[PDB]
Amino acid sequence: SWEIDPKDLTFLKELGTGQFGVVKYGKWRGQYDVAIKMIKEGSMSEDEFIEEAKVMMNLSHEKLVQLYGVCTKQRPIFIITEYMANGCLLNYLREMRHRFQTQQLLEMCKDVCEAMEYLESKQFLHRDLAARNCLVNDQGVVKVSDFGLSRYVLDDEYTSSVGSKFPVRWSPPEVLMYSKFSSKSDIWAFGVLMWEIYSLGKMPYERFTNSETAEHIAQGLRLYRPHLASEKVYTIMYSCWHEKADERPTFKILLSNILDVMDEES
Ligand SMILES: Cc1c(NC(=O)c2cc3c(s2)CCCC3)cccc1-c1cn(C)c(=O)c(Nc2ccc([C@@H]3C(=O)N(C)CCN3C)cc2)n1
């Protein structure tokens, strides 16, 4: 059930490169748009991923990027997914021509929060939630991408907490200090993602290094209010950054808060 025949794929366009190498746009059976991860040799724990892919095929939500299947008979292996025409959310936010209204920004947060609440309901962590790992479709709907795949990355610079590619600026103190990953580390990251959205893709803690960020957030320093965020919106993102993990909200609570602010500020 999980296995796509790669001969059914027509490759049409380069979409760029990620942690596992090249990603392409194409058609499945000459008709249906797909994206194809071509998994670079040595980049992935492949056997483990493949066993997990069986489970990930059951995860389905309108705001999650849909896994269609995998090609695992030949190397490089392929991950086939839903295609998102407007690319990654970070680059989308950075294009100032969009001149987003604040209601549109809050809708982007809601899109992500819905996906994350779904994943929360299935006891499934993202582990690398950030604007760079969200995608945007042709209707401007934001969807969460590459949830769970951090587990199969073989690159020590990505995996190590002091590595060059580790998401230090999206991580809570307990992740950076003790590697305590939980629903609440995703909550922290989501707060940072809200900040990214309202900051139109600025780097979190843009004047600090990763090392300086780690020490500052351990001392209780936080990100502060983006110009485009109302006090009510800022309260929601800030609530994700409680020092004590158990005092952070759930995604269900965040979703209710976002919906309330939509009713109050629209
Ligand atoms: C998800 C993705 C990545 N990222 C990854 O593969 C990984 C991230 C992580 C991994 S692997 C493991 C650990 C966790 C983090 C890289 C390149 C393209 C796409 C990608 C995928 N899909 C499913 C798309 O629909 C898509 N769309 C897209 C991309 C670019 C453009 C377009 C373009 O063609 N170029 C060349 C530049 C930007 N632009 C907007 C348009 C659509 N991109």
PDB file of all heavy atoms in Angstrom, residues 13-21 23 35-37 65 81-88 91 95 126 128 132-133 135-136 145-146 149-150 153 158, ligand 1:
ATOM      1  N   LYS A  13      10.428  19.859 -12.732  1.00  0.00           N
ATOM      2  CA  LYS A  13      11.055  21.062 -12.187  1.00  0.00           C
ATOM      3  C   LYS A  13      11.814  20.771 -10.897  1.00  0.00           C
ATOM      4  O   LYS A  13      11.379  19.952 -10.092  1.00  0.00           O
ATOM      5  CB  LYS A  13       9.984  22.130 -11.933  1.00  0.00           C
ATOM      6  CG  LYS A  13      10.525  23.527 -11.652  1.00  0.00           C
ATOM      7  CD  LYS A  13       9.395  24.569 -11.574  1.00  0.00           C
ATOM      8  CE  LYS A  13       8.562  24.430 -10.298  1.00  0.00           C
ATOM      9  NZ  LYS A  13       7.636  25.586 -10.089  1.00  0.00           N
ATOM     10  N   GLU A  14      12.944  21.463 -10.730  1.00  0.00           N
ATOM     11  CA  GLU A  14      13.738  21.462  -9.501  1.00  0.00           C
ATOM     12  C   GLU A  14      13.093  22.396  -8.479  1.00  0.00           C
ATOM     13  O   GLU A  14      12.830  23.562  -8.787  1.00  0.00           O
ATOM     14  CB  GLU A  14      15.155  21.986  -9.789  1.00  0.00           C
ATOM     15  CG  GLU A  14      15.938  21.222 -10.850  1.00  0.00           C
ATOM     16  CD  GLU A  14      16.230  19.780 -10.469  1.00  0.00           C
ATOM     17  OE1 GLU A  14      16.346  19.487  -9.262  1.00  0.00           O
ATOM     18  OE2 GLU A  14      16.367  18.944 -11.386  1.00  0.00           O
ATOM     19  N   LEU A  15      12.849  21.898  -7.270  1.00  0.00           N
ATOM     20  CA  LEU A  15      12.285  22.716  -6.186  1.00  0.00           C
ATOM     21  C   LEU A  15      13.315  23.165  -5.148  1.00  0.00           C
ATOM     22  O   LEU A  15      12.992  23.959  -4.266  1.00  0.00           O
ATOM     23  CB  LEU A  15      11.154  21.964  -5.484  1.00  0.00           C
ATOM     24  CG  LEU A  15       9.950  21.562  -6.339  1.00  0.00           C
ATOM     25  CD1 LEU A  15       8.967  20.805  -5.480  1.00  0.00           C
ATOM     26  CD2 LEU A  15       9.269  22.759  -6.994  1.00  0.00           C
ATOM     27  N   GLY A  16      14.543  22.665  -5.253  1.00  0.00           N
ATOM     28  CA  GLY A  16      15.618  23.040  -4.347  1.00  0.00           C
ATOM     29  C   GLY A  16      16.132  21.845  -3.589  1.00  0.00           C
ATOM     30  O   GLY A  16      15.856  20.699  -3.974  1.00  0.00           O
ATOM     31  N   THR A  17      16.896  22.109  -2.530  1.00  0.00           N
ATOM     32  CA  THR A  17      17.503  21.057  -1.709  1.00  0.00           C
ATOM     33  C   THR A  17      17.210  21.252  -0.226  1.00  0.00           C
ATOM     34  O   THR A  17      17.150  22.381   0.267  1.00  0.00           O
ATOM     35  CB  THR A  17      19.036  20.989  -1.884  1.00  0.00           C
ATOM     36  OG1 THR A  17      19.613  22.259  -1.561  1.00  0.00           O
ATOM     37  CG2 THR A  17      19.407  20.600  -3.302  1.00  0.00           C
ATOM     38  N   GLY A  18      17.039  20.129   0.470  1.00  0.00           N
ATOM     39  CA  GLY A  18      16.808  20.097   1.915  1.00  0.00           C
ATOM     40  C   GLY A  18      17.799  19.161   2.579  1.00  0.00           C
ATOM     41  O   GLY A  18      18.824  18.804   1.990  1.00  0.00           O
ATOM     42  N   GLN A  19      17.473  18.749   3.803  1.00  0.00           N
ATOM     43  CA  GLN A  19      18.348  17.907   4.613  1.00  0.00           C
ATOM     44  C   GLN A  19      18.676  16.560   3.962  1.00  0.00           C
ATOM     45  O   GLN A  19      19.762  16.027   4.183  1.00  0.00           O
ATOM     46  CB  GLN A  19      17.749  17.698   6.012  1.00  0.00           C
ATOM     47  CG  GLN A  19      18.664  16.999   7.026  1.00  0.00           C
ATOM     48  CD  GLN A  19      20.003  17.693   7.206  1.00  0.00           C
ATOM     49  OE1 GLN A  19      20.073  18.923   7.302  1.00  0.00           O
ATOM     50  NE2 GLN A  19      21.072  16.909   7.253  1.00  0.00           N
ATOM     51  N   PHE A  20      17.754  16.029   3.157  1.00  0.00           N
ATOM     52  CA  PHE A  20      17.963  14.754   2.459  1.00  0.00           C
ATOM     53  C   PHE A  20      18.323  14.899   0.976  1.00  0.00           C
ATOM     54  O   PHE A  20      18.293  13.913   0.239  1.00  0.00           O
ATOM     55  CB  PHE A  20      16.711  13.891   2.571  1.00  0.00           C
ATOM     56  CG  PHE A  20      16.340  13.511   3.971  1.00  0.00           C
ATOM     57  CD1 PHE A  20      15.043  13.719   4.438  1.00  0.00           C
ATOM     58  CD2 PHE A  20      17.256  12.880   4.808  1.00  0.00           C
ATOM     59  CE1 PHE A  20      14.686  13.337   5.723  1.00  0.00           C
ATOM     60  CE2 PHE A  20      16.900  12.496   6.100  1.00  0.00           C
ATOM     61  CZ  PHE A  20      15.614  12.720   6.556  1.00  0.00           C
ATOM     62  N   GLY A  21      18.666  16.114   0.545  1.00  0.00           N
ATOM     63  CA  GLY A  21      19.107  16.374  -0.826  1.00  0.00           C
ATOM     64  C   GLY A  21      18.028  16.999  -1.690  1.00  0.00           C
ATOM     65  O   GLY A  21      17.239  17.810  -1.211  1.00  0.00           O
ATOM     66  N   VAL A  23      14.849  17.955  -4.107  1.00  0.00           N
ATOM     67  CA  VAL A  23      13.387  17.827  -4.165  1.00  0.00           C
ATOM     68  C   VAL A  23      12.920  18.348  -5.527  1.00  0.00           C
ATOM     69  O   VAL A  23      13.382  19.395  -5.978  1.00  0.00           O
ATOM     70  CB  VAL A  23      12.700  18.610  -3.032  1.00  0.00           C
ATOM     71  CG1 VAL A  23      11.195  18.321  -2.994  1.00  0.00           C
ATOM     72  CG2 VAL A  23      13.321  18.253  -1.684  1.00  0.00           C
ATOM     73  N   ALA A  35       5.198  16.318  -5.353  1.00  0.00           N
ATOM     74  CA  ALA A  35       6.587  16.637  -5.038  1.00  0.00           C
ATOM     75  C   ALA A  35       7.322  15.343  -4.704  1.00  0.00           C
ATOM     76  O   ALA A  35       6.742  14.422  -4.115  1.00  0.00           O
ATOM     77  CB  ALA A  35       6.668  17.597  -3.882  1.00  0.00           C
ATOM     78  N   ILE A  36       8.597  15.280  -5.084  1.00  0.00           N
ATOM     79  CA  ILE A  36       9.406  14.073  -4.918  1.00  0.00           C
ATOM     80  C   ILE A  36      10.708  14.416  -4.209  1.00  0.00           C
ATOM     81  O   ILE A  36      11.545  15.128  -4.774  1.00  0.00           O
ATOM     82  CB  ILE A  36       9.727  13.390  -6.284  1.00  0.00           C
ATOM     83  CG1 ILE A  36       8.446  13.182  -7.117  1.00  0.00           C
ATOM     84  CG2 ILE A  36      10.463  12.067  -6.071  1.00  0.00           C
ATOM     85  CD1 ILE A  36       8.235  14.237  -8.160  1.00  0.00           C
ATOM     86  N   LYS A  37      10.877  13.913  -2.983  1.00  0.00           N
ATOM     87  CA  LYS A  37      12.182  13.948  -2.320  1.00  0.00           C
ATOM     88  C   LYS A  37      13.008  12.822  -2.891  1.00  0.00           C
ATOM     89  O   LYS A  37      12.570  11.666  -2.854  1.00  0.00           O
ATOM     90  CB  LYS A  37      12.086  13.689  -0.818  1.00  0.00           C
ATOM     91  CG  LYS A  37      11.654  14.836   0.045  1.00  0.00           C
ATOM     92  CD  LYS A  37      12.154  14.613   1.483  1.00  0.00           C
ATOM     93  CE  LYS A  37      11.179  15.149   2.506  1.00  0.00           C
ATOM     94  NZ  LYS A  37      10.970  16.605   2.323  1.00  0.00           N
ATOM     95  N   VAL A  65       1.011  18.342   5.193  1.00  0.00           N
ATOM     96  CA  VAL A  65       1.428  17.941   3.839  1.00  0.00           C
ATOM     97  C   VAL A  65       1.217  16.419   3.722  1.00  0.00           C
ATOM     98  O   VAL A  65       1.678  15.649   4.572  1.00  0.00           O
ATOM     99  CB  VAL A  65       2.884  18.351   3.509  1.00  0.00           C
ATOM    100  CG1 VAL A  65       3.304  17.832   2.120  1.00  0.00           C
ATOM    101  CG2 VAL A  65       3.022  19.848   3.534  1.00  0.00           C
ATOM    102  N   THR A  81       4.890  13.269  -2.137  1.00  0.00           N
ATOM    103  CA  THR A  81       3.921  14.032  -1.360  1.00  0.00           C
ATOM    104  C   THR A  81       3.075  14.975  -2.207  1.00  0.00           C
ATOM    105  O   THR A  81       3.320  15.198  -3.403  1.00  0.00           O
ATOM    106  CB  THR A  81       4.611  14.887  -0.246  1.00  0.00           C
ATOM    107  OG1 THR A  81       5.303  15.995  -0.845  1.00  0.00           O
ATOM    108  CG2 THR A  81       5.573  14.054   0.590  1.00  0.00           C
ATOM    109  N   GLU A  82       2.063  15.522  -1.547  1.00  0.00           N
ATOM    110  CA  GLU A  82       1.331  16.694  -2.009  1.00  0.00           C
ATOM    111  C   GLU A  82       2.305  17.795  -2.459  1.00  0.00           C
ATOM    112  O   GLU A  82       3.334  17.999  -1.816  1.00  0.00           O
ATOM    113  CB  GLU A  82       0.482  17.180  -0.834  1.00  0.00           C
ATOM    114  CG  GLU A  82      -0.265  18.460  -1.014  1.00  0.00           C
ATOM    115  CD  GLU A  82      -1.244  18.702   0.110  1.00  0.00           C
ATOM    116  OE1 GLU A  82      -1.148  18.028   1.169  1.00  0.00           O
ATOM    117  OE2 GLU A  82      -2.114  19.570  -0.069  1.00  0.00           O
ATOM    118  N   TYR A  83       1.985  18.460  -3.571  1.00  0.00           N
ATOM    119  CA  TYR A  83       2.744  19.618  -4.072  1.00  0.00           C
ATOM    120  C   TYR A  83       2.148  20.935  -3.560  1.00  0.00           C
ATOM    121  O   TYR A  83       0.927  21.117  -3.558  1.00  0.00           O
ATOM    122  CB  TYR A  83       2.773  19.610  -5.601  1.00  0.00           C
ATOM    123  CG  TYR A  83       3.472  20.802  -6.231  1.00  0.00           C
ATOM    124  CD1 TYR A  83       4.813  21.072  -5.953  1.00  0.00           C
ATOM    125  CD2 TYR A  83       2.796  21.657  -7.111  1.00  0.00           C
ATOM    126  CE1 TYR A  83       5.464  22.163  -6.528  1.00  0.00           C
ATOM    127  CE2 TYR A  83       3.442  22.758  -7.689  1.00  0.00           C
ATOM    128  CZ  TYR A  83       4.777  23.003  -7.397  1.00  0.00           C
ATOM    129  OH  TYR A  83       5.432  24.086  -7.966  1.00  0.00           O
ATOM    130  N   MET A  84       3.029  21.840  -3.135  1.00  0.00           N
ATOM    131  CA  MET A  84       2.664  23.129  -2.560  1.00  0.00           C
ATOM    132  C   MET A  84       3.317  24.220  -3.408  1.00  0.00           C
ATOM    133  O   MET A  84       4.508  24.489  -3.269  1.00  0.00           O
ATOM    134  CB  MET A  84       3.135  23.190  -1.100  1.00  0.00           C
ATOM    135  CG  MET A  84       2.596  22.039  -0.220  1.00  0.00           C
ATOM    136  SD  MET A  84       0.836  22.190   0.116  1.00  0.00           S
ATOM    137  CE  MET A  84       0.884  23.493   1.330  1.00  0.00           C
ATOM    138  N   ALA A  85       2.535  24.826  -4.298  1.00  0.00           N
ATOM    139  CA  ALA A  85       3.074  25.646  -5.394  1.00  0.00           C
ATOM    140  C   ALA A  85       3.820  26.919  -4.980  1.00  0.00           C
ATOM    141  O   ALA A  85       4.725  27.375  -5.698  1.00  0.00           O
ATOM    142  CB  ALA A  85       1.960  25.991  -6.378  1.00  0.00           C
ATOM    143  N   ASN A  86       3.449  27.494  -3.836  1.00  0.00           N
ATOM    144  CA  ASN A  86       4.047  28.760  -3.381  1.00  0.00           C
ATOM    145  C   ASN A  86       5.257  28.596  -2.466  1.00  0.00           C
ATOM    146  O   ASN A  86       5.787  29.582  -1.947  1.00  0.00           O
ATOM    147  CB  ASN A  86       2.969  29.670  -2.767  1.00  0.00           C
ATOM    148  CG  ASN A  86       2.148  30.384  -3.828  1.00  0.00           C
ATOM    149  OD1 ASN A  86       2.678  30.791  -4.860  1.00  0.00           O
ATOM    150  ND2 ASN A  86       0.854  30.537  -3.581  1.00  0.00           N
ATOM    151  N   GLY A  87       5.700  27.354  -2.295  1.00  0.00           N
ATOM    152  CA  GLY A  87       6.966  27.064  -1.660  1.00  0.00           C
ATOM    153  C   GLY A  87       6.951  27.207  -0.158  1.00  0.00           C
ATOM    154  O   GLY A  87       5.896  27.131   0.483  1.00  0.00           O
ATOM    155  N   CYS A  88       8.139  27.383   0.425  1.00  0.00           N
ATOM    156  CA  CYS A  88       8.262  27.435   1.880  1.00  0.00           C
ATOM    157  C   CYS A  88       7.741  28.759   2.442  1.00  0.00           C
ATOM    158  O   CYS A  88       7.884  29.827   1.835  1.00  0.00           O
ATOM    159  CB  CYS A  88       9.698  27.177   2.355  1.00  0.00           C
ATOM    160  SG  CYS A  88      10.783  28.596   2.306  1.00  0.00           S
ATOM    161  N   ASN A  91      10.229  31.913   2.948  1.00  0.00           N
ATOM    162  CA  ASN A  91      10.450  32.737   1.743  1.00  0.00           C
ATOM    163  C   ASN A  91       9.196  33.521   1.338  1.00  0.00           C
ATOM    164  O   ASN A  91       9.294  34.658   0.888  1.00  0.00           O
ATOM    165  CB  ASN A  91      10.937  31.887   0.569  1.00  0.00           C
ATOM    166  CG  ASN A  91      12.337  31.330   0.771  1.00  0.00           C
ATOM    167  OD1 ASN A  91      12.671  30.271   0.237  1.00  0.00           O
ATOM    168  ND2 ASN A  91      13.163  32.041   1.522  1.00  0.00           N
ATOM    169  N   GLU A  95       8.784  37.876   1.004  1.00  0.00           N
ATOM    170  CA  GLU A  95       8.417  38.637  -0.192  1.00  0.00           C
ATOM    171  C   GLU A  95       7.445  39.739   0.213  1.00  0.00           C
ATOM    172  O   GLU A  95       6.257  39.492   0.409  1.00  0.00           O
ATOM    173  CB  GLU A  95       7.811  37.728  -1.265  1.00  0.00           C
ATOM    174  CG  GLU A  95       8.768  36.638  -1.746  1.00  0.00           C
ATOM    175  CD  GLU A  95       8.653  36.339  -3.232  1.00  0.00           C
ATOM    176  OE1 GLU A  95       8.829  37.270  -4.049  1.00  0.00           O
ATOM    177  OE2 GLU A  95       8.413  35.165  -3.587  1.00  0.00           O
ATOM    178  N   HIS A 126       6.617  16.926  16.019  1.00  0.00           N
ATOM    179  CA  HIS A 126       7.287  17.428  14.819  1.00  0.00           C
ATOM    180  C   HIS A 126       8.802  17.345  14.989  1.00  0.00           C
ATOM    181  O   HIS A 126       9.464  16.685  14.186  1.00  0.00           O
ATOM    182  CB  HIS A 126       6.874  18.858  14.479  1.00  0.00           C
ATOM    183  CG  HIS A 126       7.287  19.273  13.102  1.00  0.00           C
ATOM    184  ND1 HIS A 126       8.605  19.361  12.709  1.00  0.00           N
ATOM    185  CD2 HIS A 126       6.550  19.577  12.012  1.00  0.00           C
ATOM    186  CE1 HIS A 126       8.661  19.730  11.440  1.00  0.00           C
ATOM    187  NE2 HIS A 126       7.427  19.866  10.994  1.00  0.00           N
ATOM    188  N   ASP A 128      11.004  19.776  14.597  1.00  0.00           N
ATOM    189  CA  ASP A 128      11.691  20.838  13.851  1.00  0.00           C
ATOM    190  C   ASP A 128      10.660  21.797  13.251  1.00  0.00           C
ATOM    191  O   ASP A 128      10.716  22.144  12.068  1.00  0.00           O
ATOM    192  CB  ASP A 128      12.607  20.227  12.784  1.00  0.00           C
ATOM    193  CG  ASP A 128      13.622  21.225  12.220  1.00  0.00           C
ATOM    194  OD1 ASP A 128      13.649  22.390  12.664  1.00  0.00           O
ATOM    195  OD2 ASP A 128      14.398  20.835  11.327  1.00  0.00           O
ATOM    196  N   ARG A 132      10.549  27.704   7.926  1.00  0.00           N
ATOM    197  CA  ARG A 132      11.249  26.979   6.855  1.00  0.00           C
ATOM    198  C   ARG A 132      10.685  25.574   6.566  1.00  0.00           C
ATOM    199  O   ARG A 132      10.855  25.054   5.460  1.00  0.00           O
ATOM    200  CB  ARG A 132      12.761  26.889   7.132  1.00  0.00           C
ATOM    201  CG  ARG A 132      13.101  26.166   8.417  1.00  0.00           C
ATOM    202  CD  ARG A 132      14.568  25.923   8.614  1.00  0.00           C
ATOM    203  NE  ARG A 132      14.711  25.213   9.873  1.00  0.00           N
ATOM    204  CZ  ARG A 132      14.637  25.771  11.080  1.00  0.00           C
ATOM    205  NH1 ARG A 132      14.458  27.069  11.242  1.00  0.00           N
ATOM    206  NH2 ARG A 132      14.738  25.013  12.151  1.00  0.00           N
ATOM    207  N   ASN A 133      10.045  24.965   7.568  1.00  0.00           N
ATOM    208  CA  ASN A 133       9.426  23.649   7.439  1.00  0.00           C
ATOM    209  C   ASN A 133       7.894  23.673   7.357  1.00  0.00           C
ATOM    210  O   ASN A 133       7.232  22.671   7.652  1.00  0.00           O
ATOM    211  CB  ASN A 133       9.920  22.740   8.566  1.00  0.00           C
ATOM    212  CG  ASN A 133      11.417  22.460   8.470  1.00  0.00           C
ATOM    213  OD1 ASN A 133      11.956  22.277   7.380  1.00  0.00           O
ATOM    214  ND2 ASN A 133      12.087  22.428   9.609  1.00  0.00           N
ATOM    215  N   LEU A 135       4.927  24.888   4.301  1.00  0.00           N
ATOM    216  CA  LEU A 135       4.782  25.148   2.865  1.00  0.00           C
ATOM    217  C   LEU A 135       3.479  25.856   2.587  1.00  0.00           C
ATOM    218  O   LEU A 135       2.557  25.808   3.398  1.00  0.00           O
ATOM    219  CB  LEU A 135       4.833  23.845   2.071  1.00  0.00           C
ATOM    220  CG  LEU A 135       6.105  23.004   2.221  1.00  0.00           C
ATOM    221  CD1 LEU A 135       5.930  21.638   1.574  1.00  0.00           C
ATOM    222  CD2 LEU A 135       7.300  23.709   1.611  1.00  0.00           C
ATOM    223  N   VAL A 136       3.402  26.485   1.418  1.00  0.00           N
ATOM    224  CA  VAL A 136       2.240  27.296   1.047  1.00  0.00           C
ATOM    225  C   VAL A 136       1.724  26.812  -0.302  1.00  0.00           C
ATOM    226  O   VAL A 136       2.498  26.679  -1.241  1.00  0.00           O
ATOM    227  CB  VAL A 136       2.605  28.786   0.977  1.00  0.00           C
ATOM    228  CG1 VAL A 136       1.369  29.627   0.711  1.00  0.00           C
ATOM    229  CG2 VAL A 136       3.273  29.245   2.284  1.00  0.00           C
ATOM    230  N   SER A 145       5.131  20.547   7.117  1.00  0.00           N
ATOM    231  CA  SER A 145       5.913  19.589   6.336  1.00  0.00           C
ATOM    232  C   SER A 145       6.999  18.934   7.193  1.00  0.00           C
ATOM    233  O   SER A 145       7.497  19.532   8.146  1.00  0.00           O
ATOM    234  CB  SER A 145       6.594  20.297   5.162  1.00  0.00           C
ATOM    235  OG  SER A 145       7.204  19.358   4.276  1.00  0.00           O
ATOM    236  N   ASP A 146       7.348  17.702   6.826  1.00  0.00           N
ATOM    237  CA  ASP A 146       8.506  16.966   7.368  1.00  0.00           C
ATOM    238  C   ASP A 146       8.487  16.688   8.879  1.00  0.00           C
ATOM    239  O   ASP A 146       9.514  16.467   9.506  1.00  0.00           O
ATOM    240  CB  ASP A 146       9.788  17.656   6.903  1.00  0.00           C
ATOM    241  CG  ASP A 146       9.863  17.713   5.394  1.00  0.00           C
ATOM    242  OD1 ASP A 146       9.847  16.639   4.781  1.00  0.00           O
ATOM    243  OD2 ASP A 146       9.875  18.811   4.821  1.00  0.00           O
ATOM    244  N   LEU A 149      10.573  13.601  10.688  1.00  0.00           N
ATOM    245  CA  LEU A 149      11.687  13.101   9.871  1.00  0.00           C
ATOM    246  C   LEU A 149      13.065  13.382  10.445  1.00  0.00           C
ATOM    247  O   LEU A 149      14.023  12.736  10.035  1.00  0.00           O
ATOM    248  CB  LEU A 149      11.606  13.647   8.440  1.00  0.00           C
ATOM    249  CG  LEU A 149      10.395  13.200   7.620  1.00  0.00           C
ATOM    250  CD1 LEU A 149      10.576  13.685   6.209  1.00  0.00           C
ATOM    251  CD2 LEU A 149      10.198  11.703   7.631  1.00  0.00           C
ATOM    252  N   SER A 150      13.159  14.326  11.387  1.00  0.00           N
ATOM    253  CA  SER A 150      14.397  14.584  12.138  1.00  0.00           C
ATOM    254  C   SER A 150      15.011  13.320  12.729  1.00  0.00           C
ATOM    255  O   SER A 150      16.233  13.196  12.819  1.00  0.00           O
ATOM    256  CB  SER A 150      14.135  15.580  13.274  1.00  0.00           C
ATOM    257  OG  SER A 150      13.294  15.018  14.273  1.00  0.00           O
ATOM    258  N   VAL A 153      17.563  11.568  10.265  1.00  0.00           N
ATOM    259  CA  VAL A 153      18.672  12.361   9.721  1.00  0.00           C
ATOM    260  C   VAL A 153      20.009  11.839  10.284  1.00  0.00           C
ATOM    261  O   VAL A 153      20.166  11.742  11.508  1.00  0.00           O
ATOM    262  CB  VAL A 153      18.488  13.862  10.059  1.00  0.00           C
ATOM    263  CG1 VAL A 153      19.673  14.679   9.614  1.00  0.00           C
ATOM    264  CG2 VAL A 153      17.214  14.403   9.420  1.00  0.00           C
ATOM    265  N   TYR A 158      23.239  18.531  12.085  1.00  0.00           N
ATOM    266  CA  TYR A 158      21.797  18.707  12.294  1.00  0.00           C
ATOM    267  C   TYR A 158      21.352  18.199  13.663  1.00  0.00           C
ATOM    268  O   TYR A 158      20.605  18.890  14.370  1.00  0.00           O
ATOM    269  CB  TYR A 158      21.002  18.022  11.178  1.00  0.00           C
ATOM    270  CG  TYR A 158      19.496  18.157  11.323  1.00  0.00           C
ATOM    271  CD1 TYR A 158      18.813  19.278  10.833  1.00  0.00           C
ATOM    272  CD2 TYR A 158      18.757  17.162  11.959  1.00  0.00           C
ATOM    273  CE1 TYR A 158      17.417  19.394  10.977  1.00  0.00           C
ATOM    274  CE2 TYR A 158      17.374  17.269  12.114  1.00  0.00           C
ATOM    275  CZ  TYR A 158      16.710  18.377  11.619  1.00  0.00           C
ATOM    276  OH  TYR A 158      15.349  18.452  11.791  1.00  0.00           O
TER     277      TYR A 158
HETATM  278  C1  LIG B   1      10.168  20.304   1.892  1.00  0.00           C
HETATM  279  C2  LIG B   1      11.181  20.805   0.864  1.00  0.00           C
HETATM  280  C3  LIG B   1      12.535  20.868   1.253  1.00  0.00           C
HETATM  281  N1  LIG B   1      12.883  20.460   2.546  1.00  0.00           N
HETATM  282  C4  LIG B   1      13.150  19.162   2.839  1.00  0.00           C
HETATM  283  O1  LIG B   1      13.109  18.300   1.971  1.00  0.00           O
HETATM  284  C5  LIG B   1      13.425  18.725   4.210  1.00  0.00           C
HETATM  285  C6  LIG B   1      13.283  19.414   5.387  1.00  0.00           C
HETATM  286  C7  LIG B   1      13.594  18.678   6.516  1.00  0.00           C
HETATM  287  C8  LIG B   1      13.950  17.402   6.252  1.00  0.00           C
HETATM  288  S1  LIG B   1      13.927  17.101   4.579  1.00  0.00           S
HETATM  289  C9  LIG B   1      14.329  16.365   7.295  1.00  0.00           C
HETATM  290  C10 LIG B   1      14.461  17.015   8.679  1.00  0.00           C
HETATM  291  C11 LIG B   1      13.342  18.036   8.899  1.00  0.00           C
HETATM  292  C12 LIG B   1      13.537  19.213   7.940  1.00  0.00           C
HETATM  293  C13 LIG B   1      13.513  21.338   0.377  1.00  0.00           C
HETATM  294  C14 LIG B   1      13.172  21.742  -0.908  1.00  0.00           C
HETATM  295  C15 LIG B   1      11.847  21.682  -1.325  1.00  0.00           C
HETATM  296  C16 LIG B   1      10.834  21.212  -0.457  1.00  0.00           C
HETATM  297  C17 LIG B   1       9.440  21.200  -0.999  1.00  0.00           C
HETATM  298  C18 LIG B   1       8.574  20.156  -0.798  1.00  0.00           C
HETATM  299  N2  LIG B   1       7.298  20.159  -1.282  1.00  0.00           N
HETATM  300  C19 LIG B   1       6.422  19.026  -0.946  1.00  0.00           C
HETATM  301  C20 LIG B   1       6.870  21.217  -2.017  1.00  0.00           C
HETATM  302  O2  LIG B   1       5.736  21.274  -2.476  1.00  0.00           O
HETATM  303  C21 LIG B   1       7.826  22.311  -2.268  1.00  0.00           C
HETATM  304  N3  LIG B   1       7.373  23.380  -3.035  1.00  0.00           N
HETATM  305  C22 LIG B   1       8.110  24.388  -3.684  1.00  0.00           C
HETATM  306  C23 LIG B   1       9.460  24.689  -3.477  1.00  0.00           C
HETATM  307  C24 LIG B   1      10.058  25.731  -4.167  1.00  0.00           C
HETATM  308  C25 LIG B   1       9.317  26.501  -5.061  1.00  0.00           C
HETATM  309  C26 LIG B   1       9.907  27.654  -5.847  1.00  0.00           C
HETATM  310  C27 LIG B   1      11.099  27.159  -6.613  1.00  0.00           C
HETATM  311  O3  LIG B   1      10.874  26.429  -7.560  1.00  0.00           O
HETATM  312  N4  LIG B   1      12.359  27.477  -6.278  1.00  0.00           N
HETATM  313  C28 LIG B   1      13.472  26.943  -7.080  1.00  0.00           C
HETATM  314  C29 LIG B   1      12.704  28.361  -5.151  1.00  0.00           C
HETATM  315  C30 LIG B   1      11.522  28.745  -4.240  1.00  0.00           C
HETATM  316  N5  LIG B   1      10.233  28.793  -4.967  1.00  0.00           N
HETATM  317  C31 LIG B   1       9.097  29.382  -4.231  1.00  0.00           C
HETATM  318  C32 LIG B   1       7.979  26.218  -5.248  1.00  0.00           C
HETATM  319  C33 LIG B   1       7.381  25.183  -4.571  1.00  0.00           C
HETATM  320  N6  LIG B   1       9.030  22.247  -1.727  1.00  0.00           N
END
